[PDB]
């Protein structure tokens, strides 16, 4: 997250860190046994880290649970990042409390202008590199379809939306991938991609989660 603020310990209790020896991607807890992340985060040897603020310090609210199975979206295209969504089942149910809590799936798509909370442990620089160890937050509005398509000609599908600021300075960045965009208490986005970070006229592109609710619910019901 570039141009965000320090969330505060466990203030985003649905935020997970995907660990394969190190934080590599965000995720969103959606019930005691399932995480939603970006398909482009897929790899084996995933350990889901819940209750995290400092990812380098054991602070006392962590639950570390190995992934038992990953399900990349059937129609995920790694070249276009169309359908950049994946589900991870935990080997055991997370113990749910004030600091480790599921985020509600949307019943409806969010609209341009709606303010959302974007969070993750990604790069905090637009030029050069600095990884924070504590969770960073950004309040960003969803952008119009037409703005999003103008910003990225030929690249925005019906499964993508832009959130952020065309003036730049405030964005998601490398290491935020797979993390949440929460708009009035609902998971509407997954940190998917962008052109660099916090560049003018290159806002963050997010997986449109409302498109995937029937897939998520069916997958969970049979896995």
126 annotated among ligand-binding-site residues: no
**Could you report how far apart the first and last alpha carbons of the chain are, in Å?**
33
Record the tokens describing residue 43, joined without a space.
């790899």
Contact with Cl ion (CB under 5 A) among 66, 104, 146, 218: 146
Minimum CB separation from Ca ion for residue 61, in Å? 8
62 annotated among ligand-binding-site residues: yes
Output DSSP code: residue 45.
Answer: S
Examine the residue annotation and report whether 176 is marked as an active-site residue of this protein.
no
Examine the residue annotation and report whether 20 is marked as an active-site residue of this protein.
no
Q: Which does 144 bind (CB under 5 to 8 A by kind): Na ion, Cl ion, Ca ion, none?
A: Cl ion
From 81-89, 102-110, 117-125, 138-146, give the range in contact with Cl ion by CB under 5 A.
138-146
Q: Which does 145 bind (CB under 5 to 8 A by kind): Ca ion, Na ion, Cl ion, none?
A: Cl ion
For residue 218, what are the contacts with CB-CB under 8 A and spacing of at least 6? none
Record the tokens describing residue 102, joined without a space.
């599921």
Contact with Na ion (CB under 5 A) among 33, 82, 123, 159: 33
Question: Other C-beta atoms within 10 Å of 24: how many?
Answer: 17
Name residues contacting Cl ion, limited to 41-100 (CB under 5 A).
none
The nearer residue to Na ion, 34 or 76, going by C-beta atoms, is: 34
Helix (H, G, I), strand (E, B) or coil at 4: coil
For residue 162, what are the contacts with CB-CB under 8 A and spacing of at least 6? 142, 143, 147, 148, 151, 152, 156, 203, 204, 205, 206
Task: Choose, from 28, 40, 73, 176, the residue flagged as catalytic.
Answer: 40
From 29-37, 112-120, 165-173, 204-212, give the range in contact with Na ion by CB under 5 A.
29-37
Minimum CB separation from Na ion for residue 38, in Å? 22
Minimum CB separation from Na ion for residue 90, in Å? 8
Minimum CB separation from Na ion for residue 68, in Å? 10
Burial class (CB in 10 A: 0-12, 13-18, 19+), 128: exposed
Gap between the Cα atoms of 154 and 55, Å rounded:
37
Name residues contacting Ca ion, limited to 12-51 (CB under 5 A).
none
From 25-33, 75-83, 125-133, 191-199, give the range in contact with Na ion by CB under 5 A.
25-33
Gap between the Cα atoms of 161 and 42, Å rounded:
21
Binding-site residue numbers are: 52, 54, 57, 62, 171-172, 174-175, 177
Please give the positions annotated as active site. Answer: 40, 84, 177
Binding residues (CB under 5 A) for Ca ion: these are 52, 54, 59
């Amino acid at each position: 997250i570039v141009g965000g603020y320090t969330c505060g310990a466990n203030t985003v209790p649905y935020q997970v860190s995907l660990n394969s020896g190190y934080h590599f991607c965000g995720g969103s807890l959606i019930n005691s046994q399932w995480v939603v992340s970006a398909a482009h985060c897929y790899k084996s040897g995933i350990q889901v880290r819940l209750g995290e603020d400092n990812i380098n310090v054991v602070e006392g609210n962590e639950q570390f649970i190995s992934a038992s199975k990953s399900i990349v979206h059937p129609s995920y295209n790694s070249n276009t990042l169309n359908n950049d969504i994946m589900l991870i089942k935990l080997k055991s149910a997370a113990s749910l409390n004030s600091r480790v809590a599921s985020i509600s799936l949307p019943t409806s798509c969010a609209s341009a202008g709606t303010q959302c909370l974007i969070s993750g442990w990604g790069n905090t620089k637009s030029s050069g590199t600095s990884y924070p160890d504590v969770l960073k937050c950004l309040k960003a509005p969803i952008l119009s379809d037409s703005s999003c398509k103008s910003a990225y000609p030929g690249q925005i599908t019906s499964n993508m939306f832009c959130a952020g600021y065309l003036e730049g300075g405030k964005d998601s960045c490398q290491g935020d991938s797979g993390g949440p965009v929460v708009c009035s208490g609902k998971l509407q986005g997954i940190v998917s991609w962008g052109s660099g970070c916090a560049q003018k006229n290159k806002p963050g592109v997010y997986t449109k989660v409302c498109n995937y609710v029937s897939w998520i619910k069916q997958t969970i019901a049979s896995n």
